[PDB]
Write a protein that binds this DNA or RNA. Sequence first.
RNA 1: ACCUCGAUGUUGGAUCAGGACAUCCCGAUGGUGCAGCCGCUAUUAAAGGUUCGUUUGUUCAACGAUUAAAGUCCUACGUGAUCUGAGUUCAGACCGGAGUAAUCCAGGUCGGUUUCUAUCUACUUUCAAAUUCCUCCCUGUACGAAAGGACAAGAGAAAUAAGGCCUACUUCACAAAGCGCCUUCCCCCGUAAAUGAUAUCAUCUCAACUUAGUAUUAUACCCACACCCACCCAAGAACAGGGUU
RNA 2: UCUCUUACUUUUAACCAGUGAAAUUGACCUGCCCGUGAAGAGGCGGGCAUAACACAGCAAGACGAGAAGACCCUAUGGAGCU
RNA 3: GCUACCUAAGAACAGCUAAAAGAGCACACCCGUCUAUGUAGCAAAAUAGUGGGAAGAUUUAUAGGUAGAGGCGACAAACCUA
Lengths: 152, 108, 115, 306, 146
Amino acid sequence: ISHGRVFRRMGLGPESRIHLLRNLLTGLVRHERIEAPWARVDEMRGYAEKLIDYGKLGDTNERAMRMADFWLTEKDLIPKLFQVLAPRYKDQTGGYTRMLQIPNRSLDRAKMAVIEYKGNCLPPLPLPRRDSHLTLLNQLLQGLRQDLRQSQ
Amino acid sequence: AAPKNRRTIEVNRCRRRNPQKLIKVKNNIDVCPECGHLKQKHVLCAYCYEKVCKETAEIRRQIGKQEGGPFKAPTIETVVLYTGETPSEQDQGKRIIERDRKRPSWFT
Amino acid sequence: AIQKMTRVRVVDNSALGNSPYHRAPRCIHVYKKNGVGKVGDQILLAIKGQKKKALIVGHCMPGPRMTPRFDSNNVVLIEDNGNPVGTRIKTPIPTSLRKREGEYSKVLAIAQNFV
Amino acid sequence: GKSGTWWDEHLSEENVPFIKQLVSDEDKAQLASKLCPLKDEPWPIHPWEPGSFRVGLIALKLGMMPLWTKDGQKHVVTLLQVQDCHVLKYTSKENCNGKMATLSVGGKTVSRFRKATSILEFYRELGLPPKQTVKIFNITDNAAIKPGTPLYAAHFRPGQYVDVTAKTIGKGFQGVMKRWGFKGQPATHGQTKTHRRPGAVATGDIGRVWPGTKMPGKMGNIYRTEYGLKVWRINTKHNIIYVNGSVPGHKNCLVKVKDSKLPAYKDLGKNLPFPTYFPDGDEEELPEDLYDENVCQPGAPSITFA
Amino acid sequence: ATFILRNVIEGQGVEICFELYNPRVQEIQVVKLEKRLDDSLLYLRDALPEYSTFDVNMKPVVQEPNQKVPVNELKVKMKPKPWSKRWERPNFNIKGIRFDLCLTEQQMKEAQKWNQPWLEFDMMREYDTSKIEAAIWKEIEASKRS
RNA sequence: ACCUCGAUGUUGGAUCAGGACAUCCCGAUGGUGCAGCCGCUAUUAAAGGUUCGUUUGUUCAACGAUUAAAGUCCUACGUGAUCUGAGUUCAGACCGGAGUAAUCCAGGUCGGUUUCUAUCUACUUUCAAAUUCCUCCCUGUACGAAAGGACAAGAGAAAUAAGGCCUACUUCACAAAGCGCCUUCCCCCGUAAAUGAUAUCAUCUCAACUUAGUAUUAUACCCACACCCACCCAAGAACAGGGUU
RNA sequence: UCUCUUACUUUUAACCAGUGAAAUUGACCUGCCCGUGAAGAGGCGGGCAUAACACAGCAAGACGAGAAGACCCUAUGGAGCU
RNA sequence: GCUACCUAAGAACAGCUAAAAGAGCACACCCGUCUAUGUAGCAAAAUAGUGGGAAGAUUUAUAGGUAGAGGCGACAAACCUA
Ligand SMILES: [Mg+2]
Ligand SMILES: [Mg+2]
Ligand SMILES: [Mg+2]
Ligand SMILES: [Mg+2]
Ligand SMILES: [Mg+2]
Ligand SMILES: [Mg+2]
Ligand SMILES: [Mg+2]
Ligand SMILES: [Mg+2]
Ligand SMILES: [Mg+2]
Ligand SMILES: [Mg+2]
Ligand SMILES: [Mg+2]
Ligand SMILES: [Mg+2]
Ligand SMILES: [Mg+2]
Ligand SMILES: [Mg+2]
Ligand SMILES: [Mg+2]
Ligand SMILES: [Mg+2]
Ligand SMILES: [Mg+2]
Ligand SMILES: [Mg+2]
Ligand SMILES: [Mg+2]
Ligand SMILES: [Mg+2]
Ligand SMILES: [Mg+2]
Ligand SMILES: [Mg+2]
Ligand SMILES: [Mg+2]
Ligand SMILES: [Mg+2]
Ligand SMILES: [Mg+2]
Ligand SMILES: [Mg+2]
Ligand SMILES: [Mg+2]
Ligand SMILES: [Mg+2]
Ligand SMILES: [Mg+2]
Ligand SMILES: [Mg+2]
Ligand SMILES: [Zn+2]
């Protein structure tokens, strides 16, 4: 029975799971693009949201500094996270880290996904664009909207 | 445990040819507006995915060739370029990484 | 909860519980349908190798809300018919035992402090 | 062949919020239109009879809050909020089973995009938004109510025992000790793979097992009826029912509360509205909270014993 | 909402479980408002009786409500090792027990094995209460005004 | 010694129960060597319990504390493809005895490997209508010379089993359990009595009928044929179940 | 250890990808009760029962699987000790 | 060449208490009293501690000898290539 409980187990326990999530977070901060199973990328995004929030809260804070030093095992990523990814989202709150699903892997055929931050100097992934506002259904909806607006 | 007799071929057919074990026919396969290499709903196309993966790999190769040794991570943003294209005025403090090919139509 | 084979300390002023002995007095039976004894129940206590009844005046587990929670199992000795053994009760007795008033009239009268 | 489709598939980026707002305004207008059922064409109201019953309500279990009385005791009440409760249709006596009439009552409102075609057609012909679940109450003949009237939580009054039934929390495929409550073998007393095993199931002479043998499996995924639930407080503004005891089910779920059928509470609804509490024809505004003559009100100036 | 009060009455520990919202409560009076280094004094059952013993007829000390609530940084000893719970475990996080005059270095060394440094940086398990606090404060202000 | 030495596992205990009365009890009668609470006899009814412990190896057997009881038999002297051998069916040894020795003990003791991935039948909430102890005015009344104590009714507190909950106590926390809380509603056939002939009295009827004397032809969960990529879930092994305004 | 069990992690458990067994098999279109028989019947008599096909757990039976029983008895078949 | 015994030349045993010792705890090492896991397993005899010894009746690398009407035996009818 696991009602209302998340925390998907991956490694041999909580410590191994946290270590794997920290490694994934470091890789995502470095390369800004990682393909991994859906649960792993979901947890990575969930932790990266709070990481970006804490990095945006301030730099001189000792709590955020200790958290960045703990969750980043490369040291050099801390100044980058504090001076690039923090001033970038100064106008956004919690709207970032877009998740996209890929088919399968050519090894064990496992469900994977790729996530990335907004902006991104790398070319954007092919986003599932919706239908244009010129199809029959869209034109009929626009006509009905204009009719109800002129009738009001 | 040990069987007292032997299962027949009829029981085997009824067990292995049931619609529960047979593979279901999915109806989520469509086409892609770009390129078109048989994609699926809620799943990105493999062709454009491979293209953007190769492009990201080339950009990372160029970055590693420009950075040199490990343990760097610059404190400024980055911007990639292609053949020609002079840097703009709002891209002075960003690292310039130019390539050696024309600019694609899917990267603006 | 005071069940059986429990090392309880006598808090009375008699010559049985206050006298030293090589074995602590332990309960052997609870006068109830089940084997769970709460405050205000009659139990059998073996003191100095004998058979005498007892009365639970405060265990250690928290029952309801408006009730005390003593750190030690307090038990006042009692005979068969309603006559207490001890005459001075130094340990405080909770006010939850005053709802009887019929079978423990003298035990509540020989007491001192109340919580 | 035909592929899967939904409602927000062939829409642009400027049409989905428009459709959402339009359908929201539509359902709000449809809910507001059925606000005064008495001024329309109401059915004739019959007086209360000792040999008759009435229709229940559908509430939503919010949570459980403690409650105290005037004598000093502490009880427990459960919050049952009635969001939207209406009548769907009406079946006569000679069309169901030839015994007692029935009424179709729906739960809270939902969307029109995730329902069947027949359900949408029925809710369009009736004039109400679709509901989540549909319940049926067995009533008599003189308690006939026109379908399409709002049902508030003020239908019950403090001082009546009701029965609330819902779907309990399922445990899935669990063991037998946690399901039926069977005792287990000792732990480290040399036991070899038997700490949670039932052991025997039958005898050796019968050569089989009985169907009424308690064995592990699915448990909890069923509806259970609870009896003996007295109400202590009736809310009017938020429409909250304060039933004593526990409600079988989890939180934020639709329940089914109705009158009790126990022999100790046979004819006790003579001081209650037999049809339906109408806030239009009553010619009076009930207070926000209806307290009982035994529950300690929150505005009490510290009750003291004497 | 309930709270347990610890006090020794005639060499006997009495713990009453009152209720903050109960019709039988007459009046709640604070005798000495002060904080400590721990938010849960459940370890007082295994301590010396002289620490948990207070005078029942003591006079409440009055002060200003602007002293930032003075915190009493007083350490309490413990009875040998017949204790109730394992307070030496890092999961309890207690900074008010003198482990120098009660336990040895090997006991602390073997008890520190259950330390979870990753729990302090779990991030997701942190309950950030700010908007809810502002909402309930606005609600209580609107209820107190009119 | 009638299938069973090309193999029928052997005493208990834990778990799980089924059936039967030659019935301990609560349901209902008649008598008494029934003065009232303590007892006995004969009948109908199985919807339940049959405790907490010690030591001896026990199904046997011994002793301490309760209520109405610590009831009996069969189910491979129930159940080892679920669990343990404390002995009982070996290889070693010790004490006592028979025996030239070897050897043996329906005389005693120390320890003495417990193996199987479910093939087949059959099962996986049958949805539900419980049982009982104590106290209070009656009660210190009928009863004897005295102990003592009810028959029945009303009210209040409680024990086992079943159906649920986390918000108040605990395990300790975006959840799940009990040590905490709510409810559990109808009986079951044996007599006591009018009139009546056969048998003009009398007669309760394996005659035609009248009263306790049959509860019930009971009541609530749950009963919309098809939008389904994907996400979430108090729903969940897959599947299936609910929401996405 | 129990009254009275519980909170979490791993192996393991359920599905996806492949290598892939062992014991065992007269054939099975394989339900229950009463009674009978080589004496304990899913295949016999009389009744009750019945659209078909997989997945996930327990043991009541098919006197289920492994050893031509080590316990009792026969053998003019052996061997050890005195 | 595993195991019983013997022969010649070698190696091994931290640290503390070392009462002088076929002394004690305790590394590496010699053997395996018990629990749990499997009995077609990692293994035709395994996995951790609770275990006894560990300055000597201790263990071990090399080479040789004692074999069935027998070898050997601090005597288990124990061992002599599962
Ligand atoms: Mg894993
Ligand atoms: Mg157990
Ligand atoms: Mg075990
Ligand atoms: Mg074993
Ligand atoms: Mg404790
Ligand atoms: Mg024979
Ligand atoms: Mg035989
Ligand atoms: Mg055979
Ligand atoms: Mg066999
Ligand atoms: Mg009888
Ligand atoms: Mg015992
Ligand atoms: Mg047997
Ligand atoms: Mg068996
Ligand atoms: Mg076995
Ligand atoms: Mg031994
Ligand atoms: Mg099966
Ligand atoms: Mg078969
Ligand atoms: Mg597979
Ligand atoms: Mg024949
Ligand atoms: Mg038969
Ligand atoms: Mg057969
Ligand atoms: Mg043979
Ligand atoms: Mg012969
Ligand atoms: Mg011969
Ligand atoms: Mg010969
Ligand atoms: Mg010979
Ligand atoms: Mg030797
Ligand atoms: Mg020595
Ligand atoms: Mg030694
Ligand atoms: Mg010998
Ligand atoms: Zn494409």
